């Protein structure tokens, strides 16, 4: 699972077999780190009109 | 069922009869109107190509 974002800690409780989180419209919202099994929240890198 | 349009009513008409209200009721009707959408802009290069 490739992407680009601000990774953070999170309070989300994935089930022990689950690896990725998705929001309502397919967009990835979290991942389990595969070495230390914490759930990282994913948020996109900041962008906007100038 | 075949729907009914409402109560059928022969208005009590004749060439010399008038009906006049002896009392009234103040009514407060509520009318609701949309005025504005949520404003959106899309970076179409970021949407198409990520
Ligand atoms: C990977 O190795 C580290 C060594 O500190 C350990 O803490 C962790 O639990 C290990 N994870 C797996 C999936 O074996
Ligand atoms: C007019 O209608 C209201 C509501 O039914 C009633 O309280 C009031 O007494 C009536 N007044 C007359 C003059 O009939």
UniProtKB/Swiss-Prot annotation, chain A:
Domain of life: Viruses
Complex formation: Binds to host ACE2. RBD also interacts with the N-linked glycan on 'Asn-90' of ACE2. Cleavage of S generates a polybasic C-terminal sequence on S1 that binds to host Neuropilin-1 (NRP1) and Neuropilin-2 (NRP2) receptors. Interacts with host integrin alpha-5/beta-1 (ITGA5:ITGB1) and with ACE2 in complex with integrin alpha-5/beta-1 (ITGA5:ITGB1). May interact via cytoplasmic c-terminus with M protein. May interact (via N-terminus) with host bilirubin and biliverdin, thereby preventing antibody binding to the SARS-CoV-2 spike NTD via an allosteric mechanism.
Function: Attaches the virion to the cell membrane by interacting with host receptor, initiating the infection. The major receptor is host ACE2. When S2/S2' has been cleaved, binding to the receptor triggers direct fusion at the cell membrane. When S2/S2' has not been cleaved, binding to the receptor results in internalization of the virus by endocytosis using host TFRC and GRM2 and leading to fusion of the virion membrane with the host endosomal membrane. Alternatively, may use NRP1/NRP2 and integrin as entry receptors.
Protein name: Spike protein S1
Positions spanned in the full protein: 546 to 595 of 1273
